[PDB]
Design an enzyme around this catalytic site. Structure first.
Site, PDB file in Angstrom:
ATOM      1  N   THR A  73       0.268   9.739   5.658  1.00 14.69           N
ATOM      2  CA  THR A  73       0.553   8.898   4.507  1.00 14.69           C
ATOM      3  C   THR A  73      -0.069   9.480   3.243  1.00 14.69           C
ATOM      4  O   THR A  73      -1.025  10.258   3.291  1.00 14.69           O
ATOM      5  CB  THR A  73       0.037   7.473   4.732  1.00 14.69           C
ATOM      6  OG1 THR A  73       0.447   6.638   3.642  1.00 14.69           O
ATOM      7  CG2 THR A  73      -1.481   7.462   4.834  1.00 14.69           C
TER       8      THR A  73
ATOM      9  N   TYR B 176       3.199   3.874  -3.834  1.00 13.68           N
ATOM     10  CA  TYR B 176       3.809   5.184  -3.668  1.00 13.68           C
ATOM     11  C   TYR B 176       5.212   5.031  -3.096  1.00 13.68           C
ATOM     12  O   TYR B 176       5.429   4.260  -2.157  1.00 13.68           O
ATOM     13  CB  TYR B 176       2.964   6.079  -2.757  1.00 13.68           C
ATOM     14  CG  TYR B 176       1.573   6.352  -3.286  1.00 13.68           C
ATOM     15  CD1 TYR B 176       1.378   6.782  -4.593  1.00 13.68           C
ATOM     16  CD2 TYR B 176       0.457   6.188  -2.477  1.00 13.68           C
ATOM     17  CE1 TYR B 176       0.111   7.032  -5.081  1.00 13.68           C
ATOM     18  CE2 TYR B 176      -0.814   6.439  -2.956  1.00 13.68           C
ATOM     19  CZ  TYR B 176      -0.981   6.861  -4.258  1.00 13.68           C
ATOM     20  OH  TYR B 176      -2.246   7.110  -4.737  1.00 13.68           O
TER      21      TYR B 176
ATOM     22  N   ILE C 266       0.829  -1.203   0.000  1.00 11.24           N
ATOM     23  CA  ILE C 266       0.000   0.000   0.000  1.00 11.24           C
ATOM     24  C   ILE C 266       0.865   1.255   0.000  1.00 11.24           C
ATOM     25  O   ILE C 266       0.834   2.049  -0.946  1.00 11.24           O
ATOM     26  CB  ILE C 266      -0.966  -0.012   1.200  1.00 11.24           C
ATOM     27  CG1 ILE C 266      -2.037  -1.088   1.014  1.00 11.24           C
ATOM     28  CG2 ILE C 266      -1.614   1.353   1.379  1.00 11.24           C
ATOM     29  CD1 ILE C 266      -3.001  -0.795  -0.112  1.00 11.24           C
ATOM     30  N   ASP C 267       1.657   1.443   1.055  1.00 10.52           N
ATOM     31  CA  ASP C 267       2.438   2.661   1.227  1.00 10.52           C
ATOM     32  C   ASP C 267       3.443   2.485   2.358  1.00 10.52           C
ATOM     33  O   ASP C 267       3.144   1.812   3.354  1.00 10.52           O
ATOM     34  CB  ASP C 267       1.517   3.849   1.517  1.00 10.52           C
ATOM     35  CG  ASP C 267       2.247   5.176   1.489  1.00 10.52           C
ATOM     36  OD1 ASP C 267       2.724   5.572   0.405  1.00 10.52           O
ATOM     37  OD2 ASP C 267       2.343   5.827   2.550  1.00 10.52           O
ATOM     38  N   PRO C 268       4.643   3.053   2.241  1.00 16.72           N
ATOM     39  CA  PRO C 268       5.573   3.035   3.374  1.00 16.72           C
ATOM     40  C   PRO C 268       4.984   3.762   4.574  1.00 16.72           C
ATOM     41  O   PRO C 268       4.294   4.773   4.435  1.00 16.72           O
ATOM     42  CB  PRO C 268       6.812   3.756   2.829  1.00 16.72           C
ATOM     43  CG  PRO C 268       6.716   3.615   1.350  1.00 16.72           C
ATOM     44  CD  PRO C 268       5.252   3.629   1.031  1.00 16.72           C
TER      45      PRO C 268
END
Lengths: 426, 218, 813
Positions: free
Chosen positions: B130, B122, B67-69
């Site tokens: 985020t 991303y 999904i995202d860091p």
């Protein structure tokens, strides 16, 4: 998805991806559909065309031996491999033919025995069928759960002919010479001709085939017809050397493409005969061959299957012959006999009058309807009264010519069957 | 190994020749967005933004996209920080340790795996929230995914909410396995029991199945 | 309370709600809230076998379910098609479910909301105050929308609040960038609820020097620093980019009826929101009228890469998410998808929109005045062209003579324009109002005050062009009519596709006839071809050619032949000629031509040679009934239009008849769509076969005939190609024509719905009279039942190069 397909592929897509041995004509629809809507099975995206697949069972055979060699020591099961048509079957699978897709269904008792045997042990991948002289004889039993001898004895218990079996243990590098082949042939001596002798080691899937050639050329005679009225015969070829030529089907005879009463050399054997297969070159028209075989077999005869039954004596007896009932000669008696047999009456109604008549006269499903298409009819009371052709382009082959010649008998049979159906269903 | 210099903070960019055809494009796509991006503190350092661009792609055949860091503690490799406290690495280890059959897991380190590469939609985010820099690489998130899907045959993604329009986001209809986030797709815990599906799909493409215990560190 | 609707929209939150936007006579906007639902249909047993108590149950009533699965038969022993009659109920459930045996899974939930509650999207309703619950000022909530809309009143005009905005942003490359380039000018034409049409252009003052700003202020421009200093009554207002973007955000947050823009979704709104987020970190907060949810400006693309034909692929359409009820209308997508143009650019549409024939007063070397009074032009275009010219400054003289207006003036039933054009001999010229043609980069390199004002004028002209197109196309009236007919939201009237357009009226017809069509087996699609254009007899013709067309050919043949899938008795396929003729002799005694009909369709399978579809013409189907009702309604609205005098009623009736024409000329196309509810392979094949038969009959009756001594002798007799009729059959007919007329008829070309007939006559008037007489004869004697034709024009020197490729001169009737 875990529910179905994908990781399971229903055990059809994954098998058909790489294994071409199980490529019968039933599964082509399912495989093509699954591959085509690969983006619509559950999820994901994938498109490809896998149309026109054929049963490549030859993957189970590594190579064929034409010369003597040296066999490795071990435990061997020796069986006789016969000559004739080849078929496959697996747990009620459609009886498909290798290279043509023929679907001549086996009788009920042999199918019952085969499925009972396969239910006894599930290790039998497939079993081969041989149709020499219009007879069903067991050929092989490829299995790993149990030894093939148990499968053969279980099949023979039901009352089905099985090939002989031998077990040989060798602890040395014995040369596979002609003497071993001769003694193994003598051990499997039978009235049914065999094309070779096969040896199986520990039920290995890959297998070797060994055979020799003893071709000779003396002379060739006319093709004999064994028409006896029981619809069980083959178009055997008689030579001038005192021996005949084994023919599995009329398709082999028409595929041979060899002249008649000339310098002809075909594949002879030590004690049998194998019809030569056209694999070289040469100039030869199909029409001349068809004419020179049809005039020999008979003007009223033609080319299809293994029956090519006569037409001039059709009358009402051929209807009884195709319905496996007693002989009859009057319309009302035949109708009463049909009504008495419940199975026959049930099986009549699911087939059309045209289809029943074309099966009664044994008209092939390749050119009869094609000839009917390009010709005009005048019909009264749903019975053919007048017929006329307009183009000779379909008359090049003698088969259409003789079908047109016997079209009068065909119309008579069509009218008879139509009258029988009308009197039976009113 | 190739090195390029830009006019912003990252300067040197770490990547591989496999990613080379798009790198220059990325450079210009990072020229006009770094000014408004470096002004806000980010989880990775400017040099750490281009870290996962150097692993080989020919050997790898399955890509796993996250999904995202997480907003802090940038490392340059998704779900890699060894701490046994954050849900990311623990989930990325336990999604395969239980399926393979091994226990006593502390980290999988997908970097050393030659068949599977972790990924995120991303590249980075801001310290505090985020998806705070998604606009600056909205087309970089396109070109990177296009480049990686042209080198692998199977694409795996986590989270249907942020990956629903992947097919519209992709041009070449390459096979894309869809999956749920190991922590929570949308208020729902996922055990990620679809790795055997990935193995069988890779096997169907005449390729060796992924060994999910090659890099298991215990 | 009397409310006229403007748009319908539903929220995208966790607790989804449906909202209605309307306005009263005074001009106060009213928002109404309803609970969004999920609609399913069940039978008696299924409804009685629901373990959880249903949220709400409504008796749908008696209805008949018919299976529409083709059963190919090789003989006349064809079983009857499956059919049943049962009571059905409709159920509303807020959350998604998976209920078995729940049919009607294709119709949208918004269509069900419109139809079940008996709500017309564009209607004017006098709501009841007893059943209305107030949330807050301007926003109400209703729990029983069925009783809320119990009263309807005739429509009344209301001054709609409009925002026609255009935005010119800086750019150095082909397309401006958000992170690289700033917004320069924003021109707004804002029409309040009081009717005050205010034109104002906001400029970014940060690109001008202090002396330049002072000079602009001296020239009339207003310089501001805070939003409290904004004044809307000044055309030119200078402000900083942050202030300009805040003003734009506060404008877009207003409850405008229509924010109409050209390519705004792709460029204008996206750039505005992205620049606002980048420069200040702010987001355009769209708020629901209930003040319970808020969102930001997100633009999502709906992509439709499918044509189901031979042409290429269409484009994607961008949409803006919001809950303020404002239609962010884009005219670009509507024009592209509802009109064919050589180029999809603003300049082409502007050139082809308004045209005027004007007289040259003076020449003065390069100084010409083009007076556009009604004497030199048609009627009606004078006022519209004056309105367009008020806000415009460039004229396309002839076809490529770009000129700049020097002086502007307004005259009654005309206009005054002067241009710098080279001296020309002709007196009357056709001027088309083309877009401004300038090299933006070259004049931007020397940006100054005059260039800024010129760009502001260009921007205000572009912004007002949206209003001009909105009035010209009747987009308000056409949108209201499309909402009323298609049963769709006003924002979704153009956004949705043909299947969703039909699904409203199709569901209405199905409810009226109590018909359900169900398909169980998976559908299979085969190439049905479709076409009759053959090689012409001759390509060179020095004589006139008469053109005759069919008025709604496909709807009429569907009505006459009863070409419906649920009326199709069966299909008989032939592989052999003998069984084919036996089947023919059986069906000519079992399916008589007087009652049934047989259509020779193309064989669906390669082995077959002849396929016969037997249609029972005793019960009319859903497709013929749809087409007949649409044609009747269009005719009624056209004849009501013909007696109208007020311009508003003229536009309303024209729009309604246009929508009925569009919805009528879609069922044949949708019969070839697999996923549509009108899918029928056999019916489509029968329709194209009947069309080909009609074209063949028209060609035969119009080829080989002759005109001599007032008597017309057709080459072939008047024989019905389908069955046998009871009327005169002699081709020789008498006409009231001059005896000296000696002409021959020889058709050479025929399209799918048109047939070209050549006549050796050279006089235009004689050719027109002969064509009219032929049309009367065809409609009176040759045709039968409910078939008619019409005369369009006469083609002269018609020369054909290939199929569907001819060159000729067309003369009006």
């Amino acid at each position: 998805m875990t529910s179905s397909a994908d990781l399971t592929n229903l055990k059809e897509l994954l098998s058909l991806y790489k294994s071409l041995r199980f490529s019968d004509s039933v599964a082509i629809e399912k495989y093509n559909s699954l591959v085509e809507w690969g983006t619509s099975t559950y999820w994901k995206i994938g498109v490809q065309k896998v149309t026109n697949v054929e049963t490549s069972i030859s993957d189970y055979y590594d190579e064929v031996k034409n010369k003597p060699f040296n066999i490795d020591p071990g435990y061997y099961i020796f069986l006789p491999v016969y000559f004739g048509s080849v078929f496959i079957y697996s747990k009620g699978k459609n009886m498909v033919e290798l290279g043509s897709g023929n679907s001549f269904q086996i009788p009920d008792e042999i199918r019952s025995a085969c499925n009972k045997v396969l239910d006894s042990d599930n290790g039998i991948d497939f079993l081969r069928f041989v149709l020499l002289n219009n007879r069903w004889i067991m050929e092989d039993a490829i299995s790993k759960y149990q030894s093939p001898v148990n499968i053969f004895k279980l099949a023979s218990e039901y009352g089905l002919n099985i090939p002989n079996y031998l077990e040989i243990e060798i602890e040395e590098d014995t040369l596979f010479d002609d003497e071993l082949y001769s003694i193994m042939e003598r051990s499997f001596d039978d009235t049914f001709p065999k094309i070779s002798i096969s040896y199986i080691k520990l039920g290995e899937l890959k297998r070797q085939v060994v055979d020799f050639f003893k071709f000779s050329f003396m002379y060739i005679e006319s093709i004999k017809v064994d028409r006896i009225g029981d619809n069980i015969f083959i178009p055997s070829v008689i030579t001038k050397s005192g021996k005949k030529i084994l023919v599995k089907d009329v398709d082999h005879l028409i595929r041979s493409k060899v002249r008649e009463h000339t310098f002809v050399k075909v594949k002879k054997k030590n004690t049998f005969s194998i019809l030569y297969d056209y694999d070289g070159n040469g100039t030869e028209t199909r029409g001349e061959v068809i004419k020179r075989i049809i005039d020999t077999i008979g003007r009223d005869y033609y080319v299809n299957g293994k029956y090519f039954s006569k037409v001039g004596i059709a009358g009402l007896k051929q209807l009884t012959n195709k319905l496996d009932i007693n002989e009859c000669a009057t319309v009302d008696e035949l109708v009463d006999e049909i009504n008495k047999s419940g199975t026959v009456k049930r099986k009549i109604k699911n087939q059309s009058v045209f289809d029943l008549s074309r099966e009664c006269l044994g008209y092939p499903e390749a050119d009869f309807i094609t000839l009917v298409n390009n010709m005009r009819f005048k019909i009264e009371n749903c019975k053919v009264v007048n017929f006329n052709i307009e183009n000779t382009n379909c008359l090049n082959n003698p088969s259409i010519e003789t079908i047109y010649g016997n079209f009068n008998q065909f119309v008579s049979i069509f009218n008879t069957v139509t009258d029988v159906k009308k009197r039976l269903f009113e | 190994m190739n090195s390029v210099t830009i006019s912003h903070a990252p300067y040197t960019i770490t990547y591989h020749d496999d990613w080379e055809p798009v790198m220059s494009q990325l450079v210009e796509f990072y020229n006009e967005v770094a000014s408004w991006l470096l002004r806000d503190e980010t989880s990775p350092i400017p040099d750490k933004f281009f870290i996962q661009l150097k692993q080989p792609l020919r050997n790898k055949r399955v890509c796993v996209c996250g999904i995202d860091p997480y907003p802090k503690d940038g490392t340059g490799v998704p779900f890699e920080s060894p701490n046994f406290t954050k849900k990311s690495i623990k989930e990325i280890a336990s999604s395969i340790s239980r399926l393979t059959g091994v226990i006593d897991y502390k980290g999988y380190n997908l970097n050393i795996i030659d068949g599977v590469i972790p990924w995120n939609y991303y590249l980075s985010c801001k310290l505090g929230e985020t998806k705070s820099h998604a606009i600056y690489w909205d087309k970089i998130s396109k070109l990177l995914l296009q480049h990686i899907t042209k080198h692998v045959s199977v694409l795996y993604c986590l989270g249907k909410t942020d990956f629903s329009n992947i097919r519209a986001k992709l041009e070449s209809p390459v096979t894309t396995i869809v999956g749920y986030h190991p922590a929570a797709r949308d208020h729902q815990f996922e055990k990620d029991r679809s790795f055997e599906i990935i193995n069988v799909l890779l096997e169907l493409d005449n390729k060796t199945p992924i060994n999910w215990a090659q890099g298991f560190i215990y | 309370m009397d409310v006229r609707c403007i748009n319908w929209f539903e929220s995208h939150g966790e607790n989804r709600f449906l909202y209605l936007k309307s306005r009263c006579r005074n001009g106060e906007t009213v928002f109404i809230r309803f609970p969004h639902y999920f609609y399913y249909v069940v039978t008696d047993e299924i409804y009685q076998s629901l373990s959880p108590p249903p949220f709400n149950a409504r008796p749908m009533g008696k209805m008949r379910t018919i299976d529409i699965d083709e059963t190919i038969s090789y003989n006349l022993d064809i079983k009857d098609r499956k059919c049943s009659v049962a009571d059905m109920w409709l159920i509303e459930e807020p959350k998604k479910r998976s209920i078995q045996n729940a049919t009607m899974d294709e119709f949208f939930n918004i269509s069900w909301f419109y139809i079940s509650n008996g709500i017309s999207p564009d209607g004017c309703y006098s709501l009841d105050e007893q059943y209305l619950t107030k949330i807050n000022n301007g926003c109400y909530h209703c729990d029983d929308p069925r009783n809320c809309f119990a009263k309807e009143i005739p429509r009344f005009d209301i001054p709609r609040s409009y925002l026609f905005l255009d935005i010119e942003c800086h750019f150095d490359k082909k397309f401006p960038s958000v992170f690289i380039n700033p917004i320069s000018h924003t021109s707004y034409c804002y029409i309040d609820l009081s009717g005050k049409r205010l034109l104002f252009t906001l400029i970014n003052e940060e690109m001008l020097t202090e002396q330049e700003i002072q000079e602009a202020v001296d020239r009339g421009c207003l310089r501001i620093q805070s939003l409290m200093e904004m004044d809307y009554e000044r055309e030119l207002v200078l402000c900083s980019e942050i202030v300009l973007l805040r003003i734009a955000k506060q404008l877009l947050e207003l409850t405008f009826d229509y924010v109409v823009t050209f390519n705004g979704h792709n460029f204008d709104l996206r750039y505005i929101t992205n620049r606002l987020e980048l420069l200040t970190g702010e987001k355009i907060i769209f708020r629901s009228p209930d003040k319970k949810e808020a969102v930001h400006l997100c633009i999502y693309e709906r992509n439709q890469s499918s044509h189901k034909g031979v042409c290429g692929m269409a484009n994607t359409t961008f949409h803006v998410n919001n809950n303020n009820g404002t239609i962010f209308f884009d005219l670009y997508s509507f024009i592209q998808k509802s009109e064919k143009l050589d180029s999809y650019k603003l300049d082409s549409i502007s050139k082809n929109a308004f045209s005027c024939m004007g007289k040259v007063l003076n020449r003065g070397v390069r100084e010409m005045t083009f007076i556009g009074d009604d004497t030199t032009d048609a009627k009606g275009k004078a006022d519209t062209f004056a309105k367009v010219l008020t806000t415009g400054n460039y004229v396309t003289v002839d076809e490529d003579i770009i000129c700049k207006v020097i002086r502007k003036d307004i005259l009654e039933n005309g206009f005054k324009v002067v241009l710098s054009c080279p001296t020309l001999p002709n007196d009357i010229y056709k001027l088309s109002f083309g877009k401004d043609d300038i090299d933006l980069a070259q004049m931007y390199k020397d940006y100054n005050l005059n260039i800024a004002l010129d760009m502001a004028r260009y921007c205000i002209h572009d912004a007002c062009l949206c209003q001009y197109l909105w009035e010209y196309y009747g987009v308000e009236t056409k949108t209201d009519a499309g909402a009323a007919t298609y049963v769709l939201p006003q924002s979704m009237v153009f956004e949705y596709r043909a299947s969703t357009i039909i699904k409203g009226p199709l569901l209405k017809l199905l409810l009226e006839t109590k018909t359900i069509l169900v398909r169980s087996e998976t559908k299979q699609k085969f190439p049905y071809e479709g076409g009759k254009v053959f090689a012409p007899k001759q390509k060179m013709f020095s004589n006139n050619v008469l053109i005759f067309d069919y008025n709604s050919l496909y709807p009429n043949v569907c009505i006459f032949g009863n070409l419906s899938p649920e009326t199709l008795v069966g299909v008989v396929v032939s592989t052999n000629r003998l069984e084919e003729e036996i089947n023919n002799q059986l069906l000519l005694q079992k399916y008589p031509p007087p009652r049934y009909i047989t259509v020779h369709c193309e064989p669906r399978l390669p082995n077959l040679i002849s396929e016969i579809a037997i249609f029972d013409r005793s019960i009319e189907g859903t497709i013929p009934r749809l087409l007949r009702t649409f044609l009747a309604e269009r005719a009624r609205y056209k004849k009501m239009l013909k007696q109208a005098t007020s311009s508003t009623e003229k536009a309303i009736y024209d729009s309604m008849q246009y929508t009925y024409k569009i919805v009528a000329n879609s069922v044949y196309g949708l019969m070839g769509f697999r996923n549509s509810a009108l899918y029928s392979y056999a019916s489509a094949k029968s329709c194209t076969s009947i069309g080909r038969r009609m074209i063949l009959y028209l060609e035969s009756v119009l080829n080989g005939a002759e005109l001599s001594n007032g008597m017309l002798r057709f080459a072939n007799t008047l024989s019905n190609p389908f069955y046998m009729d009871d009327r005169d059959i002699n081709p020789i007919v008498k006409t009231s024509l001059p005896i000296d007329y000696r002409f021959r008829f020889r058709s050479v070309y025929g399209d799918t719905d048109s047939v070209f007939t050549e006549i050796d006559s050279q006089d235009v008037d004689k050719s027109i009279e002969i064509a009219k007489e032929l049309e009367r004869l065809i409609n009176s004697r040759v045709l039968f039942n409910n078939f008619k034709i019409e005369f369009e024009a006469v083609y002269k020197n018609l020369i054909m190069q290939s199929k569907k490729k001819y060159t000729t001169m067309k003369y009006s009737a």
